[PDB]
Amino acid sequence: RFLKVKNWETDVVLTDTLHLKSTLETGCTEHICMGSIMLPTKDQLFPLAKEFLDQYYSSIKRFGSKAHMDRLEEVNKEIESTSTYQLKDTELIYGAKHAWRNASRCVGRIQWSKLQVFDARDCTTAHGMFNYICNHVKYATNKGNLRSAITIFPQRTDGKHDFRVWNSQLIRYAGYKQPDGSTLGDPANVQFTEICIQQGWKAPRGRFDVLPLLLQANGNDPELFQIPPELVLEVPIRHPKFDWFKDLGLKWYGLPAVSNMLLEIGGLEFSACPFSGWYMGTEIGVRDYCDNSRYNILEEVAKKMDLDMRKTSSLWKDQALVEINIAVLYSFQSDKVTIVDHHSATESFIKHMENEYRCRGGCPADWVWIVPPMSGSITPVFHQEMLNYRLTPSFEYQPDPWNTHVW
Amino acid sequence: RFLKVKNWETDVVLTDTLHLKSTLETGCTEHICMGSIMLPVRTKDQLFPLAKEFLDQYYSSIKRFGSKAHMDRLEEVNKEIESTSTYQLKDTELIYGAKHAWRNASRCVGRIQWSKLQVFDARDCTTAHGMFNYICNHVKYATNKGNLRSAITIFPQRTDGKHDFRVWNSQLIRYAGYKQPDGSTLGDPANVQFTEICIQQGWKAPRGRFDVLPLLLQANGNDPELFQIPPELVLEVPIRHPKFDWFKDLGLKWYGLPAVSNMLLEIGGLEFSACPFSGWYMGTEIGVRDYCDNSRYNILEEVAKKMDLDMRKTSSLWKDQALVEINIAVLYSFQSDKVTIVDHHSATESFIKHMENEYRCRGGCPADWVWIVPPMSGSITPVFHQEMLNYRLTPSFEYQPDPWNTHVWK
Numbered sequence: 001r002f003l004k005v006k007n008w009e010t011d012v013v014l015t016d017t018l019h020l021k022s023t024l025e026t027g028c029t030e031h032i033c034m035g036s037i038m039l040p041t042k043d044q045l046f047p048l049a050k051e052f053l054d055q056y057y058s059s060i061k062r063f064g065s066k067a068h069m070d071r072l073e074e075v076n077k078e079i080e081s082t083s084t085y086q087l088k089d090t091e092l093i094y095g096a097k098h099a100w101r102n103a104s105r106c107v108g109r110i111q112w113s114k115l116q117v118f119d120a121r122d123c124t125t126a127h128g129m130f131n132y133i134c135n136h137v138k139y140a141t142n143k144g145n146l147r148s149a150i151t152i153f154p155q156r157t158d159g160k161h162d163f164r165v166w167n168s169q170l171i172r173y174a175g176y177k178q179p180d181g182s183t184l185g186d187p188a189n190v191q192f193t194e195i196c197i198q199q200g201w202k203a204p205r206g207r208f209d210v211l212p213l214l215l216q217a218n219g220n221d222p223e224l225f226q227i228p229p230e231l232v233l234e235v236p237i238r239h240p241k242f243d244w245f246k247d248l249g250l251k252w253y254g255l256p257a258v259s260n261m262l263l264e265i266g267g268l269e270f271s272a273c274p275f276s277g278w279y280m281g282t283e284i285g286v287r288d289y290c291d292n293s294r295y296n297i298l299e300e301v302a303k304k305m306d307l308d309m310r311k312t313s314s315l316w317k318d319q320a321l322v323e324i325n326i327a328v329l330y331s332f333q334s335d336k337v338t339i340v341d342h343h344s345a346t347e348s349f350i351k352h353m354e355n356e357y358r359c360r361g362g363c364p365a366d367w368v369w370i371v372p373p374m375s376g377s378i379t380p381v382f383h384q385e386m387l388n389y390r391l392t393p394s395f396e397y398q399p400d401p402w403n404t405h406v407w
Numbered sequence: 408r409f410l411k412v413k414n415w416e417t418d419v420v421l422t423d424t425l426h427l428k429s430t431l432e433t434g435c436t437e438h439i440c441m442g443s444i445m446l447p448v449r450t451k452d453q454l455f456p457l458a459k460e461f462l463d464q465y466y467s468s469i470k471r472f473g474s475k476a477h478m479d480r481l482e483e484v485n486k487e488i489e490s491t492s493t494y495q496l497k498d499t500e501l502i503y504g505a506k507h508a509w510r511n512a513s514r515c516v517g518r519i520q521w522s523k524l525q526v527f528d529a530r531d532c533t534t535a536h537g538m539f540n541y542i543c544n545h546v547k548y549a550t551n552k553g554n555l556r557s558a559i560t561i562f563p564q565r566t567d568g569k570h571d572f573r574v575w576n577s578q579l580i581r582y583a584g585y586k587q588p589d590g591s592t593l594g595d596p597a598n599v600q601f602t603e604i605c606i607q608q609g610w611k612a613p614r615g616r617f618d619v620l621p622l623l624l625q626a627n628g629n630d631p632e633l634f635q636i637p638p639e640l641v642l643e644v645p646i647r648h649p650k651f652d653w654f655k656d657l658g659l660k661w662y663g664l665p666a667v668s669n670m671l672l673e674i675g676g677l678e679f680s681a682c683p684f685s686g687w688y689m690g691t692e693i694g695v696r697d698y699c700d701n702s703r704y705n706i707l708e709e710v711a712k713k714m715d716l717d718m719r720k721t722s723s724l725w726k727d728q729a730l731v732e733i734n735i736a737v738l739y740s741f742q743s744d745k746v747t748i749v750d751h752h753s754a755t756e757s758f759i760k761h762m763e764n765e766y767r768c769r770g771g772c773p774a775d776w777v778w779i780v781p782p783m784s785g786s787i788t789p790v791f792h793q794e795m796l797n798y799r800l801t802p803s804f805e806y807q808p809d810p811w812n813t814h815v816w817k
């Protein structure tokens with residue numbers, strides 16, 4: 001099978017054959033596309049394991065070898081008597097780097113292979129989980145020069161001894177809903193912040209309060225911990241020309257670390273696998289700062305810019321939005337903290353994508369997510385057609401822990 | 408069957424039941440999504456069900472489903488197809504279909520105006536000159552001295568596919584593109600090929616930067632012909648900035664009437680290969696794509712340079728900065744000349760409203776997110792945060808091969 005993909009800005013056409021190895025569903029059918037929808041056992045386990053192992057050995061150029069077969073049999077036997085199996089270190093690294101390589105919503109996959117993997121499978125407690133996480137945060141932050149990483153905790157067994165990190169990200173500001181009706185801090189975390197207070201945390205009720213980690217180990221009740229403040233690198237936001245900007249009182253954290261997702265390798269599930277890399281400007285300046293549902297800072301910034309906010313046709317929101325992002329990129333670069341803008345990031349992804357086609361025969365990509373939330377059509381990925389499909393190993397969403405935990 | 412669509416900025420949830428009446432394919436499977444792909448002679452036995460389908464709709468809409476009138480027509484059409492292999496739509500039905508083809512345009516963010524559409528029955532047309540007259544009347548009614556009106560002119564429906572009527576230009580009004588030996592491209596790159604066909608056909612290009620192309624009309628399947636739209640009929644707008652008095656010196660202007668002319672309109676199985684339609688522009692179309700697309704007028708460098716911004720490193724966002732101003736200029740100029748135009752903020756907000764309405768009244772509103780969301784400031788418009796369901800419903804506007812790649816010259 002061959003599927004064509006054209007870039008209408010360079011006319012370059014690529015052929016996709018990788019989609020043939022697609023396994024899971026998309027949510028779409030022949031009668032309806034759901035492209036813009038946020039989120040649509042022993043016998044089960046062995047095929048998946050086999051599939052994975054074949055992939056691995058095929059990648060190392062030992063497909064069929066005795067080694068291959070031995071492992072193939074070893075795993076089989078193991079699943080036969082234990083109802084599961086453990087991944088050799090090498091396969092875990094591959095498994096992880098590849099779940100990334102397949103993240104159809106990640107624009108920065110050009111860096112997929114350069115990933116630091118921390119095997120946290122020997123962990124057994126929340127305190128243990130806390131030591132690991134602290135080590136991960138430190139390695140990755142690296143004094144401003146970020147490095148990609150992921151710490152993987154014990155894999156699921158019976159689902160009743162699940163390891164979970166209740167935060168959505170290792171680092172995020174608390175959200176407090178006032179009687180006033182408004183919301184202080186990050187609206188997006190209002191619920192979680194509540195659960196922290198409810199568990200004991202003592203909220204400083206500030207605008208940018210670094211939430212506490214709520215770690216759950218072996219299925220037991222989650223415990224709270226405070227990331228060592230000296231480990232949380234933050235950048236104060238200032239404009240390269242608006243000296244009044246700094247008076248906005250804006251700051252953000254430099255380490256983006258998604259922690260609420262689930263990593264699947266060879267049929268195995270890792271309900272706790274925090275991973276970090278680095279930010280693309282717009283993430284903070286466009287979505288976090290300007291989304292109506294977040295810090296919603298357009299009004300202010302505009303006012304302080306003295307623009308005709310009387311009529312929408314003045315594009316005051318557009319003018320402000322560009323300035324707010326200049327500031328973000330400016331700040332980070334000035335404090336020498338890693339960060340990439342939407343122009344570089346997207347250009348990169350195009351090269352990567354081009355490489356992925358020649359080397360792998362494709363690159364699953366979710367356009368709705370790859371294209372930045374600003375200046376869309378002036379980034380090359382806008383004019384780039386993309387095919388979306390799911391490949392394992394993979395990163396998946398999973399129910400919020402509080403909505404499923406048997407206390 | 409019920410499908411839920413959520414808006415993550417308001418938490419509003421809508422239920423789609425209209426997708427159930429979806430007919431055609433999307434290009435998507437359960438295994439692969441092609442949402443971001445540009446574009447993934449009927450028999451007589453195929454025709455009737457379609458006609459029946461259509462007629463049932465039409466009548467169900469006027470609250471006359473099953474009536475005698477309903478049945479007679481159903482029988483009348485069946486009989487006609489039986490003896491002629493096709494069938495003429497009654498005036499009332501043609502209007503219904505056109506309005507609904509637009510109503511179903513999943514890629515249209517301006518569908519809130521779907522019902523307010525002027526239909527021009529050009530089915531009695533028979534020659535290129537004839538089409539020329541018709542198109543002039545359409546341009547004039549539509550422009551309306553600057554206060555634009557939606558309209559569509561419908562020419563003879565296809566029959567044997569050898570007597571097709573076609574409008575070769577993609578939009579009734581468009582600037583010519585000329586490729587120079589230099590390697591560069593003068594005017595609109597997007598039209599280079601079509602411009603050539605025009606010159607090759609007899610047109611005498613002024614070889615300027617904003618030359619209004621000539622119409623190339625094909626009637627009854629005969630070779631296309633040339634015509635110049637009456638200048639006094641082509642309303643144009645010179646672009647200038649509300650604060651940059653050096654802007655005007657950029658030498659930019661654009662036509663006020665956006666009028667697509669290369670699509671095909673399907674009503675009750677019948678195919679209309681020539682059905683030019685026009686409405687009005689959303690700023691970003693000109694301001695972002697036509698001016699700033701790399702493969703278009705590519706004016707970012709200039710606007711940036713004259714704005715004197717740091718173009719050394721991308722992280723200074725000079726492009727983002729220049730673009731906004733350029734869009735400011737387009738909206739400004741158009742408002743100054745009292746030429747209808749809408750900004751991406753107003754248009755998208757309206758669409759959300761129209762979309763919600765459509766769910767309550769119709770039970771869905773097929774929409775292509777990849778196309779609805781503006782090419783700039785994407786997330787600060789409501790539609791970005793809006794989930795959408797894409798599916799095809801007829802009547803409809805479809806794409807069709809370029810006529811120069813299919814015509815059997817005489």
Ligand code: HEM
Nearest residue numbers: 100103105106107108111148149275276277278279280395
């Ligand atoms: C090197 C720096 C990286 C950059 C610049 C980058 C950039 C992005 C961006 C812009 C998003 C969308 C974020 C959002 O809108 O919420 C994203 C999502 C994603 N990235 Fe990357 N990424 C990087 C590293 C990583 C790493 C290290 C992994 C995996 C090991 C990865 C996995 C993902 C996943 C799972 C998603 C989708 C999350 C979701 O569905 O919400 N990324 N990335």
Ligand code: HEM
Nearest residue numbers: 509512514515516517520557559684685686687688689804
């Ligand atoms: C009232 C003014 C209107 C506005 C502001 C509006 C706006 C839009 C915009 C912004 C696009 C995308 C353009 C592009 O990116 O190339 C579009 C596409 C579309 N609109 Fe509208 N529209 C209007 C009137 C109409 C009318 C009157 C019809 C039909 C009678 C219609 C049918 C469609 C169709 C068929 C498409 C997709 C065309 C394609 O696939 O290339 N629109 N509209």
Ligand SMILES: C[C@H](O)[C@H](O)[C@H]1CNc2nc(N)[nH]c(=O)c2N1
Nearest residue numbers: 036037038368369791792793794
């Ligand atoms: C409704 C729509 O799916 C939603 O707004 C999506 C669109 N694209 C996105 N793209 C990225 N990168 N991140 C997001 O959170 C979203 N939100």
Ligand SMILES: C[C@H](O)[C@H](O)[C@H]1CNc2nc(N)[nH]c(=O)c2N1
Nearest residue numbers: 382383384385443444445777778
């Ligand atoms: C490749 C991708 O499908 C293509 O660039 C699409 C995206 N969205 C669009 N949206 C609109 N309105 N118009 C376009 O031409 C496009 N181009």
Ligand SMILES: C=CC/[NH+]=C(/N)NCCC[C@H](N)C(=O)O
Nearest residue numbers: 256257258275276277278279283
């Ligand atoms: C964990 C590394 C992924 N890299 C990222 N740049 N972002 C992940 C999501 C971050 C989220 N969009 C935010 O603004 O906080």
Ligand SMILES: C=CC/[NH+]=C(/N)NCCC[C@H](N)C(=O)O
Nearest residue numbers: 665666667684685686687688692
């Ligand atoms: C014909 C009416 C459709 N309404 C529109 N606003 N646009 C149609 C496409 C015009 C195209 N985007 C352009 O810039 O030339």
Ligand SMILES: [Zn+2]
Nearest residue numbers: 028033435440
């Ligand atoms: Zn799809």
